[PDB]
RNA sequence: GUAGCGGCGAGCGAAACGGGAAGAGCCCAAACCAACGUUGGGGUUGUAGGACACUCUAGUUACAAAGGACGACAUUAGACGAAUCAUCUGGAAAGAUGAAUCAAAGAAGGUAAUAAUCCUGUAGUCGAAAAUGUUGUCUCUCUUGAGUGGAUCCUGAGUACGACGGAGCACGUGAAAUUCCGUCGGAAUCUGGGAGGACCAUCUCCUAAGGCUAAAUACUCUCUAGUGACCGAUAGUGAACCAGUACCGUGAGGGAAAGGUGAAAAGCACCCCGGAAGGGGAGUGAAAUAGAACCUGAAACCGUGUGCU
RNA sequence: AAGCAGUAAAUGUGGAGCCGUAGCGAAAGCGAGUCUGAAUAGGGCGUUUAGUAUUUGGUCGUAGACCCGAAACCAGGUGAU
RNA sequence: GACAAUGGUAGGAGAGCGUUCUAAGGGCGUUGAAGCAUGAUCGUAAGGACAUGUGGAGCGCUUAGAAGUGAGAAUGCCGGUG
């Protein structure tokens, strides 16, 4: 019926940038919030256990040294961040490649608008069964559809995103893609 | 697919860990040697020098000074002006927009390196002797 | 943090086009009656930092 | 990590411009006016303001003046809230084989084992005697709104500034401007005074020597609700056990080790050896070498019997 | 880049800023040529005139910087049972 | 196929084994998981399986990512036992 420009959904995927984007998104979801205690942080251990020489024993300075039991940890984990950035032109390629990979395997179908009047999970289950969709599916909307979002949010393997906020991880994770024509046009226009 | 991920070939390398047995090659001394200043934890000498004889940057004299009122000009060559079509006006307001001058420091200076082969009019702060005739050789005029 | 630059070295050399360093000459401060005429003429021409010394003080001048 | 400072060595190290968050400005001393130096009015500045003479009309209780009365949300207890039945193994079913249902509820915890439909819950909605916060619509308490002329007068004094000895400005007295302290000298009054990195002249900008002011900023002993490619009993707070406890020192002070029966105590009625501890039966339990010195139970080390020597 | 929006979410906006496209000279300054020099006469440095953003690995600098070990110094307190 | 090379301290370069956690996919388990003991098994090495006893509830496999990632010595620290 309708035809989309081949700049999107019609290009050879680039696996290097896709892998880099997937790694970037996975690393940006990670918070450290991990720490240990070094020699100075542990309580006590100011004096010297015994004199330097005079008895037959190893020379020691504190009771909180790493070789002791209960002393501080040297070179442990420290709180930090793992996020990093990538040039803007390379982010656009990482999304078009994912969409093209989705469309090559016949995993993109276009439907009309969702005129839901009440949030009903059973109705969404039936319409999914009619469309013959797999267990994992991603559906986009032109804006935030409150009625569509309230439903389909308790069925395992079903997630909803907007036209603007398309993710790289979500497209790769999903098994099938269902898009409305208005949202498809918005994606074709706004996205390069 | 999230369960078959392959990074680009030749783009990842495993790091090196020292002090992990003798079969690795960096087991006991961890690539340091035996019984020196450089074999201790805390470094060696300063990057310049430490102790010893006089450093090189101590046996040479200082030269010159710097000017507080120094002016620097952004240079545009004749060959870079071939982008604009013939018989058009060129202004410092247009060179910046067209992408020729990214940073106008104190003005625009036209240097005659290349060949014009055009019929355009250009105005700028300063002109070189070579760039003056080349603009007027094939026609046109320049204004300061 | 940011790496600091040897201020004393920045007052004695200048960077050339190909990344080399241009330096001045020594032994020209005083005591000019103990040197030949040919010596003093040839001590007024600038030189270049040798490759042996370059390997040692390359990190000192990194913002220059 | 630029300009600079620096036994110009080690090293120290800026600001203006530009892009953003946030963003309201006012009150006093003097000239003048009437009492007995006092209290009221007037007046606050650089495109120079005001007193004086001239025709001259938004309560801001976070500064700008200080005490109270008017209904809506939010905390400090809670209440409703959809959906499952069979067979096999087993001590026990939530597991497997089959057939159903709910979902704005497939977060989590507990149930004799691994549960969307067994329980406490979750999504959603409702509920407040009484106390405490925020807010907004009337009360209440103050309130003189505009420009031309400049005779004369007022606009912060032991102050600004200088010398001597110090300190601080990125700047080590150096050609050191800009600003603070101690000692000693010590100015001018809009044709006035200060600054533009010694200093002088010309231009430009500003108006010290009196006092208040929310927001963007920094931090967590605590109160509620959450998360982690953080630890899992030599680890994680020193402390998962009634730990700053035992214990050590005259004192300031130092500072530990110790978690686990089983689903349910159902914690062995009764018989035999003793003085007792302990053991052998019987019994409870799926299991008692799971018997409270109790989940598994490695090594060092200590004993008994055996094939070859 | 900071900031704004967004789930502490990875994505849009944000062009102050930075690097490169042209060097030489202490500087005024000149410019594919500049400095020295009376004089490209010679000589020095340039005319390669393709970089730039992110990231894996190697090394260096500032931070304790591969780990354990002093005789000592300074500051504030406790002691004449 | 034909030839040539392969002793090694300091040190430089490359390919690999194993442990803990995470994402995705796919599996095992009261008809018995991890752990523990034995065996006459497999690969060029670090190492990997299978069977039998004990054990009573969790654990591997593939591709990627991260690191508190490997122990015989320091008159090392703590506990047990000669």
């Amino acid at each position: 019926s309708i035809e989309l420009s081949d700049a999107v959904f019609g290009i050879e995927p680039n696996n290097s940038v896709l892998f880099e984007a997937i790694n970037l998104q996975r690393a940006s979801l990670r918070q450290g919030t991990h720490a240990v205690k070094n020699r100075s942080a542990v309580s006590g251990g100011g004096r010297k256990p015994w004199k330097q020489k005079g008895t037959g024993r190893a020379r020691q300075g504190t009771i909180r040294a790493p070789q002791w039991r209960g002393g501080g940890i040297v070179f442990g984990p420290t709180p930090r961040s793992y996020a990093y950035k990538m040039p803007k032109k390379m982010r656009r390629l990482a999304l078009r490649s994912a969409l093209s990979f989705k469309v090559q395997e016949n995993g993109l179908t276009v439907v009309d608008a969702f005129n839901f009047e009440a949030p009903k999970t059973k109705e969404f289950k039936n319409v999914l069964s009619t469309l013959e969709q797999p267990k994992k599916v991603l559906v986009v909307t032109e804006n935030e559809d409150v009625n569509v979002e309230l439903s389909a949010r308790n069925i395992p393997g079903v997630q909803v995103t907007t036209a603007q906020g398309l993710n790289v991880l979500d497209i790769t994770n999903a098994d099938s893609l269902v898009i409305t024509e208005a949202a498809a046009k918005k994606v074709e226009e706004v996205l390069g | 697919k999230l369960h078959e991920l392959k990074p680009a070939e030749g783009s990842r390398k495993e790091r090196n860990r020292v002090g992990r047995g003798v079969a690795t090659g960096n087991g006991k001394t961890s690539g340091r040697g035996h019984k020196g200043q450089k074999a201790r934890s805390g470094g060696g000498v300063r990057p310049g020098f430490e102790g010893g004889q006089l450093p090189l940057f101590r046996r040479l004299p200082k030269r010159g000074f710097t000017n507080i009122n120094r002016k620097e000009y952004a240079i545009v060559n004749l060959d870079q002006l071939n982008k604009f079509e013939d018989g058009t006006e060129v202004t410092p307001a247009l060179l910046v927009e067209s992408g020729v001058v990214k940073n106008e420091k104190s003005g625009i200076k036209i240097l005659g390196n290349g060949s014009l082969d055009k019929k355009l009019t250009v105005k700028a702060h300063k002109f070189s002797a070579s760039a003056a005739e080349a603009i007027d050789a094939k026609g046109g005029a320049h204004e300061v | 943090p940011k790496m600091k630059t040897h201020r004393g070295a920045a007052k004695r050399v200048k960077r050339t086009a190909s990344g080399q360093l241009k330096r001045s000459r020594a032994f020209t401060s005083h005591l000019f009656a103990n040197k030949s005429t040919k010596q003093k003429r040839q001590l007024r021409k600038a030189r270049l930092v040798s490759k042996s010394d370059m390997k040692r003080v390359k990190q000192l001048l990194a913002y220059k």
Side-chain angles (χ1 to χ4, degrees):
Chain A
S1 159
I2 205 160
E3 183 64 33
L4 277 297
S5 172
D6 264 341
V8 194
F9 322 108
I11 61 173
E12 292 79 25
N14 201 297
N15 292 291
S16 306
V17 295
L18 197 43
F19 176 81
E20 294 294 328
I22 284 151
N23 198 5
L24 192 142
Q25 184 153 4
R26 266 219 73 204
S28 67
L29 278 162
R30 173 179 191 187
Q31 70 161 10
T33 61
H34 41 55
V36 286
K37 276 173 177 42
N38 63 333
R39 292 178 44 144
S40 65
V42 192
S43 79
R47 68 180 65 252
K48 189 162 170 133
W50 48 79
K51 63 203 180 178
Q52 179 95 356
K53 58 171 64 178
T55 175
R57 284 202 85 157
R59 41 202 202 185
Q60 309 286 350
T62 58
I63 65 165
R64 302 303 186 191
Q67 78 258 9
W68 284 72
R69 175 184 173 270
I73 307 300
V74 294
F75 299 155
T78 187
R80 56 182 155 118
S81 162
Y82 300 80
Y84 61 106
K85 292 181 181 180
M86 182 179 72
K88 259 181 213 163
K89 260 173 212 158
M90 293 177 71
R91 318 164 175 171
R92 309 286 268 202
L93 191 56
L95 207 49
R96 299 201 316 239
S97 46
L99 291 170
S100 178
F101 180 78
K102 194 64 91 187
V103 70
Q104 293 179 356
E105 321 209 328
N106 282 269
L108 178 137
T109 184
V110 192
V111 301
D112 283 329
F114 290 85
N115 55 3
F116 277 69
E117 298 296 327
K120 295 298 290 182
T121 308
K122 186 180 289 293
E123 175 81 326
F124 187 78
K125 272 284 218 202
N126 296 115
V127 301
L128 271 183
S129 291
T130 300
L131 281 183
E132 184 178 1
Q133 296 300 290
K135 67 181 178 67
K136 291 157 86 84
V137 61
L138 171 68
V139 56
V140 311
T141 64
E142 190 276 331
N143 285 122
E144 56 275 51
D145 290 350
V146 57
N147 290 318
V148 181
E149 203 167 10
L150 294 174
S151 85
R153 84 166 176 165
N154 217 26
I155 314 170
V158 182
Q159 65 182 357
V160 186
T161 189
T162 62
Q164 296 296 289
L166 270 171
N167 303 320
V168 166
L169 265 190
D170 288 351
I171 293 172
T172 302
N173 190 54
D175 279 11
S176 186
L177 208 72
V178 175
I179 57 184
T180 65
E181 58 197 26
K185 289 185 281 262
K186 187 186 215 143
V187 166
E188 182 65 26
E189 175 70 26
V190 174
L191 188 150
Chain B
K1 290 181 183 179
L2 282 187
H3 54 84
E4 292 96 4
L5 286 171
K6 298 293 183 182
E9 181 70 18
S11 66
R12 291 261 151 158
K13 198 173 275 292
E14 321 196 294
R15 79 204 279 173
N16 193 65
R17 314 204 295 142
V18 296
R20 287 313 185 271
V22 298
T24 69
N26 284 320
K28 189 179 59 172
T29 51
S30 307
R32 277 194 185 264
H34 283 109
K35 269 183 182 188
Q37 172 166 50
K38 303 202 275 176
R40 326 275 165 174
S41 85
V45 288
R46 315 199 314 253
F49 201 75
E50 207 169 13
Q53 75 184 346
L54 195 70
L56 178 58
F57 287 136
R58 279 285 285 286
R59 60 185 173 242
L60 302 175
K62 315 187 261 182
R63 178 71 180 266
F65 78 112
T66 194
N67 189 12
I68 183 71
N69 300 347
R70 166 94 179 141
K71 64 190 184 191
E72 186 73 24
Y73 291 84
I75 58 170
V76 185
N77 287 293
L78 293 183
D79 212 349
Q80 285 194 118
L81 288 181
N82 285 109
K83 282 90 191 170
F84 307 85
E85 201 151 345
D86 51 345
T88 67
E89 178 181 0
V90 180
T91 309
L94 183 63
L95 285 150
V96 164
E97 182 65 26
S98 168
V100 189
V101 174
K102 184 72 67 81
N103 192 28
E104 192 171 3
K105 297 180 177 67
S106 311
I108 308 298
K109 183 191 267 191
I110 305 291
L111 297 182
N113 183 37
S115 183
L116 195 54
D117 304 344
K118 276 291 185 171
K119 193 67 171 64
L120 75 165
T121 302
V122 61
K123 71 190 64 43
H125 287 84
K126 321 186 84 83
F127 287 79
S128 80
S130 306
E133 302 99 25
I135 293 177
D136 305 340
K138 312 181 53 58
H142 61 280
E143 162 89 18
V144 170
Chain C
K2 270 186 192 187
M3 182 179 72
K4 296 226 184 186
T5 285
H6 208 267
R7 305 313 271 131
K11 293 174 199 179
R12 287 158 158 105
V13 309
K14 291 174 71 175
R15 195 162 286 277
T16 73
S18 79
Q20 315 204 114
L21 291 172
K22 183 202 190 208
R23 74 161 172 94
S24 63
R25 308 296 306 262
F27 278 84
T28 71
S29 186
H30 61 113
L31 288 168
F32 292 107
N34 305 337
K35 306 179 192 113
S36 56
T37 313
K38 180 176 151 153
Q39 268 189 85
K40 306 187 288 176
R41 258 196 288 110
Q42 293 179 356
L43 279 177
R44 297 184 292 185
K45 302 287 180 197
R47 277 293 182 271
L48 293 171
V49 176
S50 58
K51 300 289 94 176
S52 296
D53 289 315
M54 185 64 72
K55 284 145 71 154
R56 194 201 308 130
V57 294
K58 68 181 178 67
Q59 295 297 109
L60 291 179
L61 299 162
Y63 294 109
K64 178 107 178 152

